[PDB]
Amino acid sequence: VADQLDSLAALLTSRAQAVRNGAAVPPQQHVQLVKGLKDAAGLVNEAREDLGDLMMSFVQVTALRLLIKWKVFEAIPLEGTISYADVAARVGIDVNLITRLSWVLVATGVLKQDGSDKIQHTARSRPYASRNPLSAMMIIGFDEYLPALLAMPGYFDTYGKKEPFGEKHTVKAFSEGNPELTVNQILASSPERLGNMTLAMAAMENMYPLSGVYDFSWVAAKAASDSNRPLIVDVGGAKGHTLQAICKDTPALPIERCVLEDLPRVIQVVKDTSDAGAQAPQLLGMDFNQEQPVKGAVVYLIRRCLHDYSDEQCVRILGHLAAAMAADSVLLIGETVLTNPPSRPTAMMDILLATIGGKERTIDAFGAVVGRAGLRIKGVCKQEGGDFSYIECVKA
Ligand SMILES: C[C@@H]1C=C[C@@H]2CCCC[C@H]2[C@@H]1C(=O)c1c(O)c(-c2ccc(O)cc2)c[nH]c1=O
Ligand SMILES: C[S@@+](CC[C@H](N)C(=O)[O-])C[C@H]1O[C@@H](n2cnc3c(N)ncnc32)[C@H](O)[C@@H]1O
């Protein structure tokens, strides 16, 4: 591990004077530098500093959450400085408490202190001065996921030390005090909490376009060779933005020949929020745990659905699609494919999904589930720079 410190020290020299020059540097040279600093921190640190760093992260997020809630970030102008006293008068809060929590963010570099008594925003804190997907993600992480993680030791004593699956008795619902409610029922308990999750999830809206990654002209051929045939069925496709993004790309394949499927309540909202003559696919309310209604489509897409469920439930879902598929049909599973071992962010998400009854999977775990549903994996397209993939499956 001698040369690891040198690859990073040579990467911190490249980034060093690109700052002094002001010239931007490649998008994925920032991500390798980000990864190196983490790993080096891992090497140099010992368990004592690990615990201190972890505890500092919890205090930092607590200060972030409170100063957001108290509108303190709003009260700090985006440029220039303001005194702690003036901030405290603006938000009507004890200047001593404002100062102590601000000092946490000064010490970690989220805020900057000027002199003995003035505070100012940095690039790292400006997103928290308004409502947007980043500040929503901050709030959701703290209000939703942190209590569930904290409750896990007691959860696994209570329910047994096994992977948690199932709609009721989630770690989340247990941590909320009502293990009989589903996560949907709980986030619906207050339309403000529902609104934050919706805004927060907008950050992953654009995600990884199926349009650029997958060719689809073979579907157009089928669309031309059979102009009577269901083309693309988006199983659990929510708003159908994936489907629309595809069909402008594919000349002989039009949005009107595709089918957006989701729960009836979701489909009804699609209807009520669409402009009168907008071009639209067919809309079908349905339950993908039951028989697939559209038979013989060219492509079935199931994107970011299977990770919410156990292997057994995924086999049920996929078996319904396999039964509806024809011999030339393709099923595309859009999911993270964990490496063994997984990356830091995907392992993080794997445990967050456990709090709601889901999991991320390796390609071996997908293969087991796909085969049990009477399918086989023909290929995988993996996004550049990450692990989110489209797994191309066909009838076995
Ligand atoms: C937006 C959310 C709010 C704050 C969290 C803080 C940062 C880590 C996770 C964030 C959360 C989040 O991103 C979530 C996901 O990405 C997914 C997700 C999981 C697998 C996928 O193939 C695609 C998306 C599921 N459920 C989430 O909640
Ligand atoms: C994580 S969202 C994925 C949305 C879309 N596929 C995308 O990539 O953004 C999961 C979707 O599955 C839908 N869903 C959950 N259970 C379902 C079911 N039993 N039948 C049909 N759709 C379901 C939800 O309404 C939601 O729109």
**Range 341-361 burial, b when 16+ CB lie within 10 A, else e:** ebeeebeebbebbbbbbbbbb
Q: How far is it, in rounded angstroms, from Cα 255 to Cα 54? A: 49
Q: How many Cβ atoms sit within 10 Å of the Cβ of residue 23?
A: 8
End-to-end CA distance of the chain: 46
Question: Where do runs of H (alpha helix) occur along 273-338?
Answer: 311-324
Tokens at 106, concatenated = 């000064």
Cβ atoms of 64 and 128 within 8 Å: the answer is yes
Give me the residues paired with residue 261 across strands.
Answer: 235, 284
* Given resolution (angstroms): 2.0
Query: Residues 6 or more apart from 46 whose CB is under 8 A from it?
Result: none
CB-based burial label for 131 (10 Å; 0-12, 13-18, 19+):
middle
Instruction: Give the count of beta carbons closer than 10 Å to the beta carbon of residue 172.
Output: 27
Q: Specify which residues 285 forms β-bridges with.
A: 262
Which letter does DSSP use for residue 141 in this model? Answer: I
Antiparallel, parallel or unpaired: β 118-121 and 111-114: antiparallel
> What is the torsional sign of CA 123, 127, 133, 138?
positive
Tokens of 306: 């299977």
In this structure, the strands spanning 118-121 and 232-235 are: unpaired
Q: Whose CA is nearest to atom 10 of ligand 1?
A: 137
Beta bridge partners of 391: 333, 380
CA dihedral 77→79→80→83, nearest 10 degrees, is 20
Strand ranges (E), the chain: 82-83, 111-114, 118-121, 232-235, 259-262, 282-285, 299-303, 330-338, 361-362, 375-382, 388-395
Strand partners of residue 301: 234, 332
User: Can you tell me the distance from the alpha carbon of 299 to that of 326, in angstroms, rounded to the nearest whole number?
Assistant: 10
Triad 151, 307, 353: Cα angle to 5°: 15
- What residue spans of 214-310 are helical by DSSP H? 217-225, 241-247, 264-272
> Which among 182, 207, 210, 262 is the best mutation to test ligand 2's pocket, defined by most ligand atoms within 8 Å of the CB?
262
Q: Which tokens hold the place of 189?
A: 């308990």
Q: Which CATH class is domain 46-129?
A: mainly alpha
Phi/psi at 246 (5° precision): -75, -45
Helix 95-108 with 47-69: angle, nearest 10 deg: 130
Q: Is 373 helix (H, G, I), strand (E, B) or coil?
A: coil
Ligand showing the shortest atom-to-Cα distance for residue 145: 1
Ligand 2 atom with the shortest distance to the CA of 287: 20
Angle value at C-alpha 90, between 84 and 93, nearest 5 degrees: 70
SS3 94: coil
What class does CATH assign to 210-395? alpha beta
Ligand 1 centre distance from Cα of residue 323 (Å): 31
Determine the Cα–Cα distance for residues 130 and 133; give it in Å rounded to an integer: 10
User: Which residue do the tokens 């775990």 mark?
Assistant: 365
C-alpha dihedral sign at 35, 41, 47, 49: negative
Q: Which amino acid is at 42?
A: G
Dihedral angle over CA of 88, 131, 356, 302, nearest 10 = -170
3-state helix vs strand vs coil in the chain, percent to 5: 55, 15, 35
Cβ pair 375, 395 in contact under 8 A: yes
Mutate to test the pocket of ligand 1, among 64, 204, 304, 356 (most ligand atoms within 8 A of CB): 204
CB-CB contact of 331 with 366 (8 Å): no
- Joined tokens for residue 123: 């690039």
Q: Which technique?
A: X-ray
Contact predicate 296/328, CB 8 Å: no
Residue 327 CB: number of other CB atoms within 10 A?
7
Residue linked to tokens 């200060």: 63
Indicate if 30 belongs to the active site: no
Q: Is 383 left (phi over 0), alpha (psi -120 to 50) or beta?
A: beta
Residue 299, CB half-sphere, CA atoms under 13 Å: how many? 30
What's the angle, vertex CA 304, arms to CA 224 and CA 272, rounded to 5?
A: 75
